[PDB]
Enzyme design. Structure first.
Site, PDB file in Angstrom:
ATOM      1  N   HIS A   1      42.237  -0.215   9.879  1.00  0.00           N
ATOM      2  CA  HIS A   1      40.987  -0.946   9.611  1.00  0.00           C
ATOM      3  C   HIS A   1      41.329  -1.714   8.119  1.00  0.00           C
ATOM      4  O   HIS A   1      40.606  -2.539   7.724  1.00  0.00           O
ATOM      5  CB  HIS A   1      39.754  -0.206   9.524  1.00  0.00           C
ATOM      6  CG  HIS A   1      39.468   0.579   8.373  1.00  0.00           C
ATOM      7  ND1 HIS A   1      39.164   2.041   8.686  1.00  0.00           N
ATOM      8  CD2 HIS A   1      39.016   0.450   7.417  1.00  0.00           C
ATOM      9  CE1 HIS A   1      39.022   2.626   7.679  1.00  0.00           C
ATOM     10  NE2 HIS A   1      38.819   1.609   6.716  1.00  0.00           N
TER      11      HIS A   1
ATOM     12  N   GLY B   1      36.671   2.850  -0.804  1.00  0.00           N
ATOM     13  CA  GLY B   1      38.054   2.753  -1.445  1.00  0.00           C
ATOM     14  C   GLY B   1      38.821   4.162  -1.172  1.00  0.00           C
ATOM     15  O   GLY B   1      40.308   3.938  -1.262  1.00  0.00           O
TER      16      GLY B   1
ATOM     17  N   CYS C   1      39.601   5.578   1.898  1.00  0.00           N
ATOM     18  CA  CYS C   1      40.098   5.360   3.129  1.00  0.00           C
ATOM     19  C   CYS C   1      41.459   5.606   3.040  1.00  0.00           C
ATOM     20  O   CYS C   1      42.203   4.967   1.989  1.00  0.00           O
ATOM     21  CB  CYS C   1      39.577   4.201   3.877  1.00  0.00           C
ATOM     22  SG  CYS C   1      37.993   4.381   4.290  1.00  0.00           S
TER      23      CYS C   1
END
Lengths: 306, 306
Positions: free
Chosen positions: A41, A143, A145
């Site tokens: 993503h 942030g 991820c």
């Protein structure tokens, strides 16, 4: 003595963390040998996350649209591939800090350390459990991820988790390092049911053994029980059924303490039925389920890594 | 979102840990520049620890009686000095992994990360508080002496703690890195009174603000209070008196949440007087005091180190 929720030393993993940027989106990657692993993503805008076609989104990306920075070091991307929900960016430099490592898919109820990161920089380390319903209860801000979960066995880092999503309920979902989600979750900003969670019974029993070893023994009672009787109480209190495999894993703690596993089960039954009556166990006013039998043995026997 | 007891990333400290051996005794040291820091009781046998004369014991030791190993690397000891309760071993090699660092003496109620080590090898990392009575509640087995506590501010490690003793009550005592004990403790195996401990009020209030930010707001009540009224309740429940300095440190969390500090005090008063009525706050069934206001802001704003 003393008993604490302890994370693995994070240095071997700190050396692998990088920043990955694709257009407007920045998150964390994991640099091992000449491959950077990150959530697919990274290729999405806010709007894309409502209903992304990852195959179509990724086709519009070339090697040069992936910016990978290891502190000050810019890495050159020479390949990209999507595997399930992860992107693998081939880079022209093998990470000189690559530890001995494996990729493992852990079982529900197993524990691991999370190195929470922002912009490829580590902020902190904590221990948690994979819930029976395949969520984790972490600390993950925008942030985070691409932050990873891991265990260490002497010199070998076993990566088991990569952070992808916060569900609208505020619990956390992610993948193994082959990009396969734990549980039914998808990498899309949609309502997603986590399903009924249960307490990790074998972990609660391990932590009751840790309590006894450390001198907390007020909860030890006059009674014993059977596997079927205990499991009737487990059902009523949304605890995982105890199996003979769970009894066998508890064998070493039973041997050290001289307390038969079914006797410790009858102690736990009395706690479930009567509550804690305003007392604590190892500094907790509830029944703790984020220590595995292996965790308790490790901490109680001072085992070391490097 | 989510809130966890998070340790600093430990890699900068892992690179400084060494094994120190003097005759029969092995424990951990901290290698910074060309100096190894360790507990002076490395020179004692079991029998010595009953009533050691450290000055007389150390006079019988030469440079060559200190064996210092950094993983496989043997360091050459070229000087030794006793400072308060620490030994400083001058070695002929500056540690190539020395981070930017300071030595700090922390205040009661402040938090830090412990890297628990055995034989100079790191086993795990956890966050704890210096109790008002200058003990810590750690996880320290035989061999853990010389393990250190620290904070990190971007790239700078502030060492605040070195582990020396387990009291007969099972709580832990140690020094700053100048070898001055926190509290009244001595490096002798004797009965030692820790004195009455209190709850770190300003930390409990910080954690109640963390709860509100994360959506846990059931405990927010109709009432306000005064500093003197609250402190009357603080006294009765063995909480530290709240001062205006504590109110001022809570200012940023009050501003973010729109909840006046004295309103949060009246929420805490109601919890102290009525208990939690079988509810939880951020997954805890008691009032947590091991997060500082700074800890809550850090975690809630995703601040990073390197």
């Amino acid at each position: 003595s003393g008993f604490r929720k302890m994370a693995f030393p994070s240095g071997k993993v700190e050396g692998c963390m990088v920043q990955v940027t694709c257009g407007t989106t920045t998150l964390n990657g994991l640099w091992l040998d000449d491959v950077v692993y990150c959530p697919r993503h990274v290729i999405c805008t806010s709007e894309d996350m409502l209903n992304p076609n990852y195959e179509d989104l990724l086709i519009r990306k070339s090697n040069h649209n992936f910016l990978v920075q290891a502190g000050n070091v810019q890495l050159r991307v020479i390949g990209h591939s999507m595997q399930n929900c992860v992107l693998k960016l081939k880079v022209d430099t093998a990470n000189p800090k690559t530890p001995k490592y494996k990729f493992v898919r852990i079982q529900p109820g197993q524990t691991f350390s999370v190195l929470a990161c922002y912009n490829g920089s580590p902020s902190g380390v904590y221990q948690c459990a994979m819930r029976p319903n395949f969520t984790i209860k972490g600390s993950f801000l925008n942030g985070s991820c691409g932050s990873v979960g891991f265990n260490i066995d002497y010199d070998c880092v076993s990566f088991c988790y990569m952070h992808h999503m916060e569900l609208p309920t505020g619990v956390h979902a992610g993948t193994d390092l082959e990009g396969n989600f734990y549980g039914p979750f998808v990498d899309r900003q949609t309502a997603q049911a986590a399903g009924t969670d249960t307490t990790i019974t074998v972990n609660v029993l391990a932590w009751l053994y840790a309590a006894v070893i450390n001198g907390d023994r007020w909860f030890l009672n006059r009674f014993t029980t059977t596997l079927n009787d205990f499991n009737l109480v487990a059902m009523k209190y949304n605890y995982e059924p105890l199996t003979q495999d769970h009894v066998d894993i508890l064998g070493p703690l039973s041997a050290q303490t001289g307390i038969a596993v079914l006797d410790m089960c009858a102690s736990l039954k009395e706690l479930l039925q009567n509550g804690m009556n305003g007392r604590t166990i190892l500094g907790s006013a509830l029944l703790e389920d984020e220590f595995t039998p292996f965790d308790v043995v490790r901490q109680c026997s001072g085992v070391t890594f490097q």
